[PDB]
């Protein structure tokens, strides 16, 4: 009857290491784990990446947080798979989503 | 004290930068020494440990040194404490004042 | 991830001294603690 | 206990006693640390001069 | 059955004894040798002739 | 009659701290663990001002001065927030923490 | 954390025997188990007891059914508890819903 | 190349990386260049 399909969960895509670092973040709402992030041009804090501003995407969050979570941890390095990311729906262009993290130690496959 | 055994506990622990007693100012606990607890420890989430099968373990020492030009080694400990109890009602806590 | 462990302790077991007669307002010479000991130990689900 | 079952009426069937279950699964802690062997240049507060 | 004794002894070069497919050695299997809990050897993974290396 | 011996621990995380060499238009004496940006126009190297947003490009490793045409600086890793010196212009701790966002350099 | 608990399902209240009867069903919605049912005033079909009609409820469904089910089986004798059987929210008077199945072989204990 | 086993059929290698998220990886190296020195020996016909 109820067919459930267990699947292994490997966000990583490449053998490159995935170092995580902590930083203050002005998160707005409940952000699920492994969410794209950006840096506010004014408050200098960290918020969920809009999916529209180019290059503003700074990193990928590590542990789900909220507005009350002062310090947020996020990966700085590593390669991640496109399908296994909860992107903002604003980023509607596949190539933009792909190359958004270009120029830093975070990359996509 | 007749049938009940009286103790006075004063253990301390160090938080981020300062020390503090485990107990607040005035607590009184009715307990039984025969009550059974649980020192349960979960599975060590470590691929290296799983390489030789130390899933269920109390502690887990681990050492490694970074490669490349910078050279510096670490000390690593892993455990999953789940200190638990059999019955909650067998203990009574009273905050004195 | 913030997780919780609520064993199921009854509200009776964690009774504090809230009230106007806890221990300090009592007379130090005449008042006894043994009555308090019994009134807090009888509801302990077993000998203590 | 036995309250008032009268021997004229069948009575009622007492429901059985059922337990309760709880989970306290996760558990973890890991105190990493470092030695930075470059520290070894300076003398320890031990190891008398 | 053409001979009285059916037993034959063949020496084998050590290079023919190693971990199968050059797999990484584990706690119990080392260089194609099976080691029990007490350290006694149990089995050997031997390769066939290596000449020519083809 | 008291000289404390603090444990010199510049590093703050297990991530490797790689170095790199680059020409530097330094205009002063820069001690170690000094933040530095890339020059906007000349593309030389000067100490990070603490006012430009995200301009910092790394952390200097070995102290040098104006005379040093080239310099060696850390390119990756994580350092403590305290041991790293900061330009006096930088005031709020939030932008200090987020100074090296999007780079292999981070602080705790 | 989750206290799922375990209680023994005992819909039968007293040792009075339980009998079943199969009749055509005119249900308008998906009917879960333990649902009171009355007879339709027009088509003499079976419709889940709305709760406003007094004493017109005839049976208590045993096995959950739906509209597509042409006929269904309902309990016609026995004593059942109060919380065990799902009831319509239109009926509100405690005594009235206790005596809803009065005059029949179905009793509420 | 260090081990001197460059020329072989298959090279499996299993190892765990360092760091806190220490995870294990497996590699299967090979360089197949299968050939035939008599191409005209075989004749392929596409039927129709």
DSSP string, chain H: --SS--SSS-EEEEEE--STT--EEEEEE-------S-GGG-------
Q: Of the candidates B42, B73, B75, which has its C-beta nearest D27's C-beta? A: B42
CA distance linking residue B11 with residue B31, whole number of Å: 18
Cβ(D43)–Cβ(D49) below 8 Å: yes
CA distance linking residue D42 with residue B80, whole number of Å: 37
Contact call for C10 and B96, based on CB within 8 A: no
CA distance linking residue F33 with residue F63, whole number of Å: 8
Helix, strand, coil shares, percent, chain F, to 5: 5, 30, 65
- Touching partners of D (3+ C-beta pairs < 8 Å): B, C, F, G
Cβ(F58)–Cβ(F36) below 8 Å: yes
Estimate to the nearest angstrom the gap between the alpha carbon of A27 and the chain centroid: 13
Nearest alpha-carbon partner for A80 in A22, A25, A31, A9: A9
Contact call for F8 and D42, based on CB within 8 A: yes
Q: Of the candidates G1, G6, G14, which has its C-beta nearest D12's C-beta? A: G14
CA distance linking residue A19 with residue F14, whole number of Å: 8
- Number of residues assigned to chain G: 109
For residue C6, the chain G residues in CB contact (below 8 A) are 1
Nearest alpha-carbon partner for G108 in G13, G1, G5, G6: G13
Q: What are phi and psi of F62, to 5 degrees?
A: -115, 130
Q: Which residues contact F59 (CB under 8 A, 6 or more apart)?
A: F33, F34, F35, F36, F73, F74, F79, F84, F105
Contact call for B97 and C16, based on CB within 8 A: yes
For residue D34, the chain F residues in CB contact (below 8 A) are 9, 11, 14
* Alpha-carbon distance B50 to nearest alpha carbon in chain F (angstroms): 22
Helices (H), chain F: 93-97
| Lookup result for tokens 């109060």 | G82
Chain F's closest residue to D46, CA to CA, is: F5
Cis, peptide link before residue E52, omega less than 30° from 0: yes
Chain B's closest residue to H15, CA to CA, is: B48
Q: Could you write out the DSSP letters of every residue in B18-86?
A: SEEESS-SSEEEE--TT--EE--B-B---HHHHHTT--B-S--EE--B--SSS--BEEEE-B-B--EES
Nearest alpha-carbon partner for B64 in A18, H17, F80: H17
CATH number of G20-108: 2.40.300.10
Q: Which residues of F74-102 are buried (b: 16+ CB within 10 A; e: fewer)?
A: bbbbbbeeeebebeeebeeebbbbbbbbb
Interface of D with C in 1-40 (CB under 8 A): 20, 22, 24, 26
Contact call for F78 and A21, based on CB within 8 A: yes
Q: Please give the method by which this entry was determined.
A: cryo-EM
CA distance linking residue B69 with residue F77, whole number of Å: 13
CA distance linking residue A40 with residue F101, whole number of Å: 11
CA distance linking residue G7 with residue G18, whole number of Å: 21
Q: What is the largest CA-CA distance in chain F?
A: 52
Chain A contact present for H17, CB below 8 A: yes
Nearest alpha-carbon partner for F47 in F67, F107, F55: F55
For residue F17, the chain A residues in CB contact (below 8 A) are none
- Number of residues assigned to chain D: 49
Chain E contact present for H33, CB below 8 A: no
For residue F9, the chain D residues in CB contact (below 8 A) are 34, 36, 39
The residues facing B74 across adjacent strands are D34
Contact call for F5 and D42, based on CB within 8 A: yes
- So what CATH class is F19-107? mainly beta
* Alpha-carbon distance B65 to nearest alpha carbon in chain D (angstroms): 10
CA distance linking residue H24 with residue B27, whole number of Å: 49
For residue C37, the chain B residues in CB contact (below 8 A) are 4
Size of interface B-F (CB pairs under 8 A): 13
Token duo for residue G7: 């209680």
Q: Of the candidates B51, B64, B65, which has its C-beta nearest H24's C-beta? A: B51
CA distance linking residue H45 with residue C28, whole number of Å: 113
CA distance linking residue B67 with residue F18, whole number of Å: 11
Strand duo G106-108 + G71-80: pairing: parallel
Judged by DSSP in three states, A84 sits in helix
- Number of residues assigned to chain F: 108
Contact call for H21 and A18, based on CB within 8 A: yes
Chain F contact present for H20, CB below 8 A: yes
DSSP state of A98: H
Resolution (Å units) = 4.1
Nearest alpha-carbon partner for F75 in F33, F30, F18: F18
Nearest alpha-carbon partner for F104 in A104, A72, C38: A104
Size of interface D-G (CB pairs under 8 A): 36
Nearest alpha-carbon partner for C40 in E26, B92, A93, G102: B92
**Dihedral sign of CA atoms A45, A49, A54, A57 in order:** positive
* Alpha-carbon distance H39 to nearest alpha carbon in chain A (angstroms): 40
Report in angstroms the alpha-carbon separations of A65 from A11, A83, E41: 18, 22, 54
């Amino acid at each position: 009857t109820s067919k459930e399909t267990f699947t292994h969960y490997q966000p990583q895509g490449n053998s490159d290491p995935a170092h995580t670092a902590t930083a203050p973040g002005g998160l707005s709402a409940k952000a699920p784990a492994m969410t794209p992030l950006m840096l506010d041009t004014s408050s200098r804090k960290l918020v969920a990446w809009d999916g529209t501003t180019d290059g503003a995407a700074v990193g990928i969050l590590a542990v789900a947080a909220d507005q009350t979570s002062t310090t947020l941890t996020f990966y700085k390095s590593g390669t991640f798979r496109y399908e296994d990311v909860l992107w903002p729906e604003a980023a509607s262009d596949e190539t933009k989503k792909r190359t958004a993290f270009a120029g830093t130690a975070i990359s996509i496959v | 004290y007749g049938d009940v055994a009286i103790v006075v506990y004063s253990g301390q622990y160090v938080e981020n930068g300062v020390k503090k007693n485990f107990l607040p100012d005035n607590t009184m606990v009715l307990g039984n020494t025969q009550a059974r607890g649980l020192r349960t420890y979960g599975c060590i989430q470590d691929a290296d440990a799983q390489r030789e099968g130390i899933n269920a373990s109390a502690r887990y020492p681990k050492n490694w040194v970074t490669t490349g030009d910078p050279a510096r080694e670490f000390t690593m400990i892993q455990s999953a404490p789940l200190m638990l109890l059999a019955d909650p009602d067998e203990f009574v806590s009273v905050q004195l004042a | 991830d913030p997780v919780e462990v609520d064993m199921g302790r009854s509200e009776e077991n964690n009774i504090t001294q809230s009230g106007g007669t806890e221990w300090s307002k009592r007379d130090k010479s005449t008042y006894d603690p043994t009555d308090d000991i019994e009134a807090y130990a009888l509801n302990a689900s077993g000998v203590v | 206990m036995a309250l008032y079952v009268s021997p004229i009426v069948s009575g009622e069937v007492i429901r059985s006693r059922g337990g309760s279950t709880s989970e306290f699964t996760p558990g973890y802690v890991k105190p990493k640390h470092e030695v930075n062997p470059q520290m070894t240049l300076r003398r320890l507060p031990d190891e008398d001069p | 059955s053409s001979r009285l004794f059916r037993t034959q002894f063949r020496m084998v070069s050590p290079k023919r004894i190693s971990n199968p497919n050059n797999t990484g050695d584990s706690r119990n299997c080392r260089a194609g040798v099976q080691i029990n809990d007490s350290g006694a050897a149990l089995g050997y993974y031997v390769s066939e002739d290596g000449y020519p290396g083809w």
